[PDB]
Amino acid sequence: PPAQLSVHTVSWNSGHERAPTNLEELLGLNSGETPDVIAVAVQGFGFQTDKPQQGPACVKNFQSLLTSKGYTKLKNTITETMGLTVYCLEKHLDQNTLKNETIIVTVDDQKKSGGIVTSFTIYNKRFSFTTSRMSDEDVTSTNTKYAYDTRLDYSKKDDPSDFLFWIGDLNVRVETNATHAKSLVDQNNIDGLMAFDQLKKAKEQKLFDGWTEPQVTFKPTYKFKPNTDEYDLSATPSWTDRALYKSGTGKTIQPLSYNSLTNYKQTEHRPVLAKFRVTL
Ligand code: HEM
């Protein structure tokens, strides 16, 4: 059983947009890396019903690229507003010990907000992947708009997972006006603008407790005029898709990279790719 493993995560608030064509870039495979685990999270509208009938393409295209690479799909879970998919190199799996499990948490009577958690064990180490979705107007267990619920947090289990990732649009925004935010973006003062981001506020309120975000060096990933690099300044530019990590058991999780994928411009938000190396 190996000393270390690699994990790629991508999330995208993709809205009504269909999965793209070039998936290699999306999953961070385009420079020949072969991560041990890949998780893909989306937030948007109408995945479950699938009225555009786009389900069949995703499967076809994702399964085509990933199977030839040695990946097994551990689980795809979709709701009306969220999607989470977890892949693992076939070579790591032992059916007797994997304990592959997913819960869905739902906070409203329309089941539009909440989250999804997918967990599995390899080499007697337990991974958990969460995505979540909250609306600004929602009444909530935290009485905030942030997409946290303690049920989705497997570091607050009696037996906390070894490696935990939370990916998606956490409904955390930049709390200042658009003029000032756009000035900071133009100056490339990413840390200056992050000073106004709400993740720290969420944490002062004991949400995402002990969860770390890798250092952010990219400009806000929202809100863009589609197919441009131009901010739509009807909203204050913000970091919407995020990746957070923790360990419940003192295991080292080292971010290698954390980047928006500005090549994917087809919508208002840009997908975010994180790569980690975890020590078992
Ligand atoms: C960038 C946007 C999207 C991404 C990245 C994405 C990603 C994924 C992934 C990774 C899977 C699992 C593929 C596999 O089987 O290995 C999946 C499945 C699926 N997607 Fe999406 N998706 C997107 C948009 C949508 C949209 C707009 C819809 C329709 C409302 C949709 C409907 C579905 C359905 C129905 C499945 C599962 C179908 C089945 O299991 O038979 N997706 N998607």
Side-chain angles (χ1 to χ4, degrees):
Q4 302 188 304
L5 297 161
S6 62
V7 176
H8 288 200
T9 63
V10 67
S11 73
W12 189 9
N13 189 334
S14 54
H16 281 80
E17 261 96 279
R18 73 175 158 192
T21 244
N22 47 332
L23 292 182
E24 277 211 340
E25 190 176 36
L26 192 62
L27 313 183
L29 303 173
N30 65 127
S31 80
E33 287 158 349
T34 38
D36 302 294
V37 178
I38 304 174
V40 182
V42 292
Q43 158 182 336
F45 290 103
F47 306 109
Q48 209 183 126
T49 301
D50 194 7
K51 291 287 207 280
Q53 279 144 135
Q54 216 277 140
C58 293
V59 177
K60 203 184 173 58
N61 307 344
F62 274 96
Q63 316 285 33
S64 308
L65 160 78
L66 289 177
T67 292
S68 76
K69 271 164 180 287
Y71 296 94
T72 293
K73 171 184 86 184
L74 294 184
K75 189 79 177 63
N76 169 256
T77 303
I78 53 162
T79 63
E80 219 54 47
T81 65
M82 301 174 271
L84 178 62
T85 302
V86 181
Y87 305 90
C88 185
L89 286 174
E90 232 310 323
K91 81 176 174 207
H92 298 313
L93 307 186
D94 167 11
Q95 193 177 105
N96 282 337
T97 184
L98 187 52
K99 297 301 163 198
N100 191 21
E101 285 279 80
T102 292
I103 63 162
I104 299 169
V105 177
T106 263
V107 299
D108 58 332
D109 72 23
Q110 307 235 320
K111 310 198 322 311
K112 286 227 276 175
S113 296
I116 304 163
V117 190
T118 289
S119 295
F120 66 94
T121 299
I122 54 184
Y123 305 106
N124 198 44
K125 300 297 148 221
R126 190 148 182 87
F127 287 78
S128 291
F129 290 89
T130 291
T131 188
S132 60
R133 189 280 201 180
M134 186 75 68
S135 66
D136 281 356
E137 291 167 9
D138 285 334
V139 172
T140 58
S141 83
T142 63
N143 204 207
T144 76
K145 75 190 170 111
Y146 310 119
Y148 184 81
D149 190 287
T150 56
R151 291 170 281 178
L152 294 167
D153 189 342
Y154 277 33
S155 76
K156 281 187 191 315
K157 290 263 153 169
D158 291 337
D159 197 6
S161 303
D162 296 276
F163 310 104
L164 295 97
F165 297 90
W166 196 311
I167 62 175
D169 180 356
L170 301 178
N171 209 32
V172 168
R173 295 295 182 264
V174 163
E175 200 170 324
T176 189
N177 62 80
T179 319
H180 186 55
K182 182 54 159 61
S183 181
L184 294 176
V185 171
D186 291 350
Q187 302 173 241
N188 196 48
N189 188 355
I190 299 309
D191 293 344
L193 188 57
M194 202 53 78
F196 302 99
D197 169 82
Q198 297 171 322
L199 184 51
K200 65 179 71 59
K201 300 191 201 284
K203 303 173 153 244
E204 286 170 1
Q205 310 160 31
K206 313 297 191 177
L207 313 186
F208 298 108
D209 189 347
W211 290 79
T212 300
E213 187 173 17
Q215 149 167 234
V216 173
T217 64
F218 46 96
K219 289 169 152 39
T221 58
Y222 167 86
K223 180 186 182 171
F224 286 97
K225 311 190 217 112
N227 319 108
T228 62
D229 297 289
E230 272 162 43
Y231 288 99
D232 177 352
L233 299 164
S234 64
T236 290
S238 297
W239 287 283
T240 54
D241 285 279
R242 315 292 281 270
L244 307 176
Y245 65 94
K246 75 186 301 201
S247 180
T249 55
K251 302 287 171 213
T252 296
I253 297 168
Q254 173 56 237
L256 302 182
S257 67
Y258 186 39
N259 299 282
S260 46
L261 302 178
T262 53
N263 282 337
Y264 297 89
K265 323 190 180 292
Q266 326 103 86
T267 204
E268 296 193 313
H269 306 247
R270 302 292 127 93
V272 170
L273 180 60
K275 308 186 187 186
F276 305 90
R277 175 171 288 125
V278 311
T279 299
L280 298 58

